[PDB]
Design a protein around this nucleic acid. Structure first.
Lengths: 55, 356, 274, 54, 53
DNA sequence: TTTCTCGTTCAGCTTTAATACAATAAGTTGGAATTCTAAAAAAGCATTGCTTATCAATTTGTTGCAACGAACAGGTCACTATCAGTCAAAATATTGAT
């Protein structure tokens, strides 16, 4: 089962903007990264945003 | 002491300190020593904080709406360790004991380290229901039962006086293991060509004898005398003798005909051996049976059947073939409760009624 | 703090709403909870004594409603058992009581009685008679008899999906009761000519009917016939009991069980020579 | 069940200024840490304060 | 859920000085006893001035 | 105008079927990791006139990298004073007898 860009963001702790979610995908802030299918992205069921930074 | 507080521990938990090298080390309240863990600040403190799940060290606890009733006692995580020392003396088979340990291990990573008269019924329900929301309902039932008998033996040793676990209910499973018809049987046997030869022989032998996959890999060519098949079940312990004159017309499989095939092609000390002329495990037989299932392409509703389902299909066939009492003594089963809960369909085939 | 009985009964209903059960079933329990509301004061659970619980329970037993007392006692007990799970109280003062044993007083139906009711159903519409013969020839429950469509019949069969249990059976259109003079086939075709609708049993307006009106109008023809019984007059559901009782002596017992929709087994036996 | 910084401060013994709430997170005075998800912390349903001193 | 020192004393019949009320705290003359938040005390809405001896 | 006519949901009750309660014994199903084995790739086989490397003895420019000398951790023992734990000091409350 693979959720879409909107469906995935509609299940997070706090729904954000479509363009915002698109930014994480480009910043690899989505583990695991979505898969390209057609024109939209397909995220994983247990997909959750992470922070690739160690201050 | 020499150093009560400092400008270094000021950003560190009670355990764990910081050396003159910017490194951190966590003390040990069992010897007074410590190990170096971490180079960063928010890492050593975020590491020496979950062992710190037990500052009892000050703080007490209280949820929303509750009562009070306590005094003093000891830990409990240790009781789970003493409980295992009692189960090993109850005289249990070497397979059931492992089933208990796996559950006790789940209780370890489920409930917080806590005394025994602290873990309220509400806390046990939060962990129990957590497995239900995941779908694993059959697990919550065993985890509850095990965690229930643990406290029972605890009260009998002067530690607890009540059994909070007996307050909460147990999940009710529905068994979503789809059955296997006679038509889907040939569909799998036909796709079992890519798989070894012992698979098809043991697949038919498991439907002609209606025995367990475990005892199916324990039969030798010495257990056959005067045309009988002496089989000693390990699960229950029942002893039966299967005649080598049986036959299933619904699938066109003769008992004697199937036996001989395992004497020429296979060959060995056991009825069902491997290509290396050696006995196989009960987990490898049903393993390859899966491959032919997925390779088939057929679809079901719920959870795909299994090699053990062959035992069920064997019973349903023998029913209409000969009689009902026949598909009861062969399965090494007695009583009068499962004989009916093993003939059902469970949302698969319509129970058609005929003029008879 | 936050205690009290009523406050809990409100947080208890939502719990049963997530149990995942039938609609009508959830309603049955609610009616029991409301009875407890006007049956016991509004005070903490730890204050409620076993005496007050039995004082209300027995009050419904003397009124004649002993059956209701059993469910109300079995439901009120579940509430407390789930209350302890939350950590509200420590004991269930309901497990100390005793449920009143009630005996079924709903009389059965015979062959002579049925014939007297069918003829008295003349004043009634033209679908009741069909519903009677059908409920006795199929031996099905009134609940599913109303949800039967002509699309269910497939090549001489009658696919019926029981709502109560959920059993799936297929009654062939070849059955016939040899005691009243009714034929499955002749009965079905009689419904296609007279009624004429999407469902086997419809109204005069060619539209499905509720299961509460099928047994309702049957009652009118019961009291209109002028037959006396012992206890409580049989109902439309009794046609199901009469159906099996007839098929057991018409064909076989293993047939009546398969017709009703049963799976497991659960008067004047004969002492054979051997 | 995870909540926001605003929703969490609403379910405490005493709601304080948002500034003070952010301070506790930075000073690591809550078990477990909120963990920044984008640009807004996400408290855990069991994340309570601890408070230190010297 | 709780009430500040001022919000609790203001509801009283004879609102005494802040100091005096703070003294009934250290002398446990108030039961149920108040808890210290950060710099102020938040009593209970049912907290009363139990005058004994 | 005025009267004949049926289906619903509500609510206090009654009745029909499946699942009981627990410790016991496995069975299933997605991989993980070691080892057998056929599948692939590099190398030996095969050989001869012609092309390229073999290397001393000694002077001169070049350079990899160990040899150390400090600084930043890396890991264990001690500084410095009272926590950490358990028994006695000092005299009468409380309990037992006159």
């Amino acid at each position: 089962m693979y959720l879409t860009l909107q469906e995935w963001n509609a299940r997070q702790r706090r729904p954000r903007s479509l363009e915002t979610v698109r930014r994480w995908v480009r910043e690899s802030r989505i583990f695991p990264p979505p898969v390209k299918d057609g024109r939209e992205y397909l995220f994983h069921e247990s997909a959750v945003k992470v922070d690739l930074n160690r201050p | 002491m020499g150093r009560r507080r400092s400008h270094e521990r000021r950003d560190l938990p009670p355990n764990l300190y910081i050396r003159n090298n910017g490194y951190y080390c966590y003390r040990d309240p069992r010897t007074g020593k410590e190990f170096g863990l971490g180079r960063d600040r928010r890492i050593a403190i975020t590491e020496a904080i979950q062992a710190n799940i037990e500052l009892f060290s000050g703080h007490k606890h209280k949820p929303l709406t509750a009562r009070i009733n306590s005094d003093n006692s000891v830990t409990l995580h240790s009781w789970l360790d003493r409980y295992e020392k009692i189960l090993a003396s109850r005289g249990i088979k070497q397979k059931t004991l492992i089933n208990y340990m796996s559950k006790i291990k789940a209780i370890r990573r489920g409930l917080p380290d806590a005394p025994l008269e602290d873990i309220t019924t509400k806390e046990i329900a939060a962990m129990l229901n957590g497995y239900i929301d995941e779908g694993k309902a059959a697990s919550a039932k065993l985890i509850r039962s095990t965690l229930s008998d643990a406290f029972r033996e605890a009260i009998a040793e002067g530690h607890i006086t009540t059994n909070h676990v007996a307050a909460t209910r147990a999940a009710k499973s529905e068994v979503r293991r789809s059955r296997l018809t006679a038509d889907e049987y040939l569909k799998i046997y036909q796709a079992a060509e890519s798989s070894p030869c012992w698979l098809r022989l043991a697949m038919e032998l498991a439907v002609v004898t209606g025995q367990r996959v475990g005892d199916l890999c324990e039969m030798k060519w010495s257990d056959i005398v005067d045309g009988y098949l002496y089989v000693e079940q390990s699960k229950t312990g029942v002893k039966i003798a299967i005649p080598t004159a049986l036959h299933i017309d619904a699938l066109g499989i003769s008992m004697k005909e199937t036996l001989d095939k395992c004497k020429e092609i296979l060959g060995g000390e056991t009825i069902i051996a491997s290509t290396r002329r050696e006995p196989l495990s009960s987990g490898t037989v049903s393993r390859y049976f899966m491959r032919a299932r997925k390779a088939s392409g057929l679809s079901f509703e719920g959870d795909p059947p299994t090699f053990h389902e062959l035992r069920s299909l064997s019973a349903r066939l023998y029913e209409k073939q000969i009689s009902d009492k026949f598909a009861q003594h062969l399965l090494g089963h007695k009583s009068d409760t499962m004989a009916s809960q093993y003939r059902d369909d469970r949302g698969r085939e319509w129970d058609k009624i005929e003029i008879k």
